[PDB]
Structures are given as C-alpha cells and as structure tokens.
Amino acid sequence: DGTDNPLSGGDQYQNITVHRHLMLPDFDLLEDIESKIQPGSQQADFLDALIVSMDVIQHETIGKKFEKRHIEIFTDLSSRFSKSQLDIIIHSLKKCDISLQFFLPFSLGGPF
Amino acid sequence: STGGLLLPSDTKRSQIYGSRQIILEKEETEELKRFDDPGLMLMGFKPLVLL
Numbered sequence: 001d002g003t004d005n006p007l008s009g010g011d012q013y014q015n016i017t018v019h020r021h022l023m024l025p026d027f028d029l030l031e032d033i034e035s036k037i038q039p040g041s042q043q044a045d046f047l048d049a050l051i052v053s054m055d056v057i058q059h060e061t062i063g064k065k066f067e068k069r070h071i072e073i074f075t076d077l078s079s080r081f082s083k084s085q086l087d088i089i090i091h092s093l094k095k096c097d098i099s100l101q102f103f104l105p106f107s108l109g110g111p112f
Numbered sequence: 113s114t115g116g117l118l119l120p121s122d123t124k125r126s127q128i129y130g131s132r133q134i135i136l137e138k139e140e141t142e143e144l145k146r147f148d149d150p151g152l153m154l155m156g157f158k159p160l161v162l163l
Binding site: 024026027 | 130
C-alpha cells in the first residue's frame, strides 16, 4: 500500500516495504506471514525489491559474516518493469557472488 | 514439587524451540504421525531401469 523502504528516492522505490532484517527467525515472522493475506492494491515493480534486498544484504553484513547469501523471487511479472540499471546490478551481483533462484506462479507457458 | 507419585495423565509433552515452549498431549503427538491405515496402496508401475 505505502512505502516504508529503508531507501526510497522520488518516484522510484515505491510500493515496496522491507519487512524484516537479517537475524534469527522465530514464530514472530511465521505469524506475520500467517496473517498478511492483504492485497494492498498498488503494483509497482519487482526488480527494485531485489536490488534493495541485495543492497541491505551488503549493508547489514557487518559483525556477522555469511557464507551463502540467498534471495528468492515470487512475482506474477504482470506489472511493467524498470530499465534504470541492469548491467550495474549484474556487476554488483557478480562482485557479491550470490546465486539467486527465481520462482514463479503457475504461469509456466485438468484439475490443477 | 511435592515428591509423591505422578501418573500417566499427570504429564504433558513439550518442545522448547527458540524462546517458546509448545505443549501437547501424548495422544496429540501419537496422532500427528498418522496418514493411513496399514498396508500398501498401488501407485502404478515403473520400469526396473529408473530406480
């Protein structure tokens, strides 16, 4: 609905909310995802969320080294993307040597 | 806390994950691992080259 992002400048980085930081998961987050069926009918972007995720990964990897840093994506991809920077994020991900995995809804291409 | 003598129904089962305890009955644990009556259910056939 809104945008409580750690970084959000101008029009870009909108309809995105970094809900949690990197620490021990408990029943708090399990409840939080258990009771967040809300739509929040404002679809803006998906790549910006991943860029913010990797940036905050680099931001909060202080005092706690991580051997494998992982990000997963779940997006219908029905909204218009952004081409503000693509090669820059590719280079930043290679220098960060993190291997993302992309997941997608039932849309790959009887009673399913 | 009184010594004495406890009895099967005087006790529960628990697990303390992270900073929270979870409490169940003996029958609750014995039941959550229930899926089927004994016996095999045929799930079709497969070649002896795939296993």
